[PDB]
A paper describes a structure:
The PHL lectin forms a seven-bladed β-propeller assembling into a homo-dimer.
Therefore, we soaked the PHL crystals with monomeric fucoside 2, 3 and 4, respectively. The second saccharide unit was clearly assigned for all three fucosides 2–4 in sites 1 and 3. The O4 of the d-arabino-hexopyranosyl unit in fucoside 2 and 4 is coordinated by a glycine backbone nitrogen in sites 1, 3, 5, and 6, while the O6 atom of fucoside 3 is linked to a tryptophan backbone oxygen in sites 4 and 6. The second saccharide unit of studied fucosides was only marginally coordinated by PHL binding sites what, together with affinity comparable to monosaccharides, suggests a low importance of this type of compounds for inhibitor design.
Residue numbers in the entry:
A (entry chain B): 26 to 369
B (entry chain A): 23 to 369
Write the structure that this text describes.
């Protein structure tokens, strides 16, 4: 098991509008986007990209601006659908084959080739890549071994080497990395210890260090990081306190202060944030109210403000964002969303 | 046909792989020197100046590879394009090496969507020539090739929100001209096209929060002018609009935390002045305001790791001086020392 998942995948697109992808009651992928590149913009409303999915769908932006959505299909293969251009429509759904048993995790190599990581039926971490920048065709599937028990998450280091994180069979946080950018050469699997009870969430700090967040065995939010830009040694685990009842979501304010969000024991949204600067101490947890039924999903918009999405008690997606003085009242974006996470 | 441009910037600035500001300029010895923040925060102490040696006959221009490695390009004493690079991300530097060619402008650099750096410069024949890395963030480099044209300023390159590189330069009729890749990563380019106007500076290009290119340049009336792609990207640009002012240097433009553009230029009194969008990145421009100082170059503007604009400019003592945004105002001008010269291949 893992902490309740994020229900949507969201990005700030090439034209500065937020765009969210979720799964409907019909198992199709639906999406919704801002009309305008600003906090409080009207929304398109929900429209279906069709498909039938059996994981969380995850959107990623190609290095040419085009959105591409990845999800497991009803045959357990990895499937995908992409924009034909940044302000045009979408391709047909296409299979990338394989048999997978987690949500896909996606990142762009420094050379522009997307690389997708997913758990296999043998519980090892598998991967596949675009053979040339922001384009098909793709490589064949290969394994990076291990035995993982959570959805994997990938990020890139400040020197260009991808690094993948996942919970191990001992419930510790484990990781593996490219030994050079764009490479098929990887390190050994190594343990960062800890006991984690959510999927990991990985971010890069302003000063070039990977930092991972997860719920711990005590249901507090815990975090651990590289002590040097793109290098070990790692810190020990440190608690950010709280008692959280979902996965956390983390995003950067426009000044690079990190801010974490999670559902609390009263089912409200709560958050804690760095104060003063991106090197400063973390605040106490404070409530943003609401009554939520998923983990929150956080993103910085084109006005440099954080916006947070979460499924509501009616199964619609609701939204709250930063104001000068505070946060805005919760508003509904409608829809009926389900948690399709391949690992729960 | 103009053979001059507004006074240039004195340094090339970059945000490092670990979020620090690092600047590059030319010493009185004609070597490339550099200076960086100790820490990624507004008001950090600086390392002080250290030499990367070389002997340059252009402005040296830094760019950051997609693997985090800094790379500096400069015209050499033999008029070839030369470069020097970090051998590892944020660590040691290579020796200077020649990429050949015969160039007659400062170089301008961008990364393609596939991670290949591509360098543009005016040639001996006055056309725009170009050369690229053959593989992502690595040598060896391609053959030199021409994009034709006849150009009379330093070129400036930027990338479209769909990954197509686009180069801008002054033409023989003093207008702003441009040329673009027809696909990302490609050697297929459009023809040269005119955006009209009269420009009296190098063009300055940026990408807005909503994914459009916008170009700024001093006009024939010495005001700051700008022009932009439209939201439909359908061929037409906006037509030129004045931001007024009377400026005596090239402009610098950067994005604030919230993506509001902000422009900087020297005034008739040799102070730094600035004008900014208000409310949002779609908002209207303010009137000009002085940031005082007495400066002897164009300003160079950049946003730091705390989300604050920092602005550098050469001072009356030929040292590099610096002022930054505070919550309230802007900080007093402070000196980073050094003795810098303007080595621009076109002035
Ligand atoms: C007419 O069928 C094609 C393939 C469908 C893809 C569906 O969705 C995929 C993700 C997989 O789950 C497939 O098993 C599933 O059929 C897709 O939904 C449909 C409409 O866009 O086109
Ligand atoms: C002794 O074998 C080492 C470490 C293994 C890591 C495995 O996968 C990790 C992610 C954890 O679940 C571990 O508990 C588990 O043994 C790993 O699979 C193996 C081959 O790559 O080498
Ligand atoms: C006075 O009530 C409003 C709406 C509440 C929103 C709640 O939380 C939302 C996220 C949804 O789940 C709604 O169905 C749910 O009622 C919200 O918590 C409250 C906080 O001041 O104001
Ligand atoms: C008037 O109905 C439209 C389409 C609805 C789409 C809903 O939300 C989608 C995500 C799927 O779950 C659909 O099955 C579900 O009906 C959506 O709930 C509603 C919100 O105002 O607008
Ligand atoms: C002893 O010479 C080598 C290459 C030199 C590069 C110099 O600087 C380059 C940028 C070019 O202008 C060359 O023509 C010029 O020689 C460089 O300055 C020197 C470092 O001490 O080593
Ligand atoms: C026969 O001339 C056309 C347009 C030329 C563009 C040139 O280069 C431009 C940048 C401007 O300076 C123009 O005034 C100049 O003629 C261009 O060089 C030539 C070859 O492609 O075709
Ligand atoms: C198609 O462009 C022309 C020239 C423009 C003015 C010129 O171009 C501007 C950029 C400045 O340099 C001005 O001083 C100069 O007069 C002028 O703004 C415009 C009038 O509609 O038409
Ligand atoms: C009442 O005159 C002021 C100064 C003008 C700014 C001009 O442009 C600035 C950038 C500097 O060069 C100034 O010295 C120059 O006067 C400014 O544009 C004008 C707006 O009404 O008010
Ligand atoms: Cl759990
Ligand atoms: Cl992305
Ligand atoms: Cl001039
Ligand atoms: Cl305006
Ligand atoms: Cl004033
Ligand atoms: Cl000088
Ligand atoms: Na964006
Ligand atoms: Na393998
Ligand atoms: Na000249």
């Amino acid at each position: 098991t893992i902490a309740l998942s994020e229900i949507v995948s969201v990005v700030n697109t090439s034209d500065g509008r937020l765009e969210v992808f979720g799964v409907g009651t019909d198992k199709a992928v639906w999406h919704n986007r801002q009309m305008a590149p600003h906090t409080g913009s009207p929304w398109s409303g929900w429209s279906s990209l069709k498909g039938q999915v059996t994981s969380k769908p995850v959107v990623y932006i190609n290095t040419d601006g085009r959105l591409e959505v990845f999800a497991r299909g009803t045959d357990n293969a990895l499937w995908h659908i992409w924009q034909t251009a940044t302000n045009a429509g979408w391709s047909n759904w296409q299979s990338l084959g394989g048999v997978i048993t987690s949500n896909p995790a996606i990142y762009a190599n420094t050379d522009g080739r997307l690389e997708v990581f997913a758990r296999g039926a043998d519980n090892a971490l598998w991967h596949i890549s675009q053979t040339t920048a922001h384009s098909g065709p793709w490589s064949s599937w290969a394994s990076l071994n291990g035995v993982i028990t959570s959805n994997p998450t990938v990020h890139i280091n400040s020197d260009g080497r991808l690094e993948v994180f996942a919970r191990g069979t001992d419930n510790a946080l484990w990781h593996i990395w490219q030994t050079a950018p764009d490479s098929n050469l990887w390190s050994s699997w190594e343990s960062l210890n800890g006991i984690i009870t959510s999927d990991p969430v990985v971010i890069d700090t302003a000063d070039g260090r990977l930092e991972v967040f997860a719920r711990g065995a005590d249901n507090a939010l815990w975090h651990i990081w590289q002590t040097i830009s793109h290098s070990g040694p790692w810190s020990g685990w440190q608690s950010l306190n709280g008692v959280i009842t979902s996965a956390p979501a983390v995003a950067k304010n426009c000044d690079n202060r990190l801010e974490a969000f999670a559902r609390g024991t009263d089912n409200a949204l709560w958050h804690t944030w760095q104060t003063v600067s991106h090197s400063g101490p973390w605040s106490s947890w404070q409530s943003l109210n609401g009554v939520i039924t998923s983990a929150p999903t956080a993103v910085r918009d084109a006005d440099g403000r954080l916006e947070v999405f979460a499924r509501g008690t009616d199964n619609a997606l609701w939204l709250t964002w930063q104001t000068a003085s505070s946060w805005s009242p919760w508003i509904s974006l409608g829809g009926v969303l389900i948690d399709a996470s391949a690992i729960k």
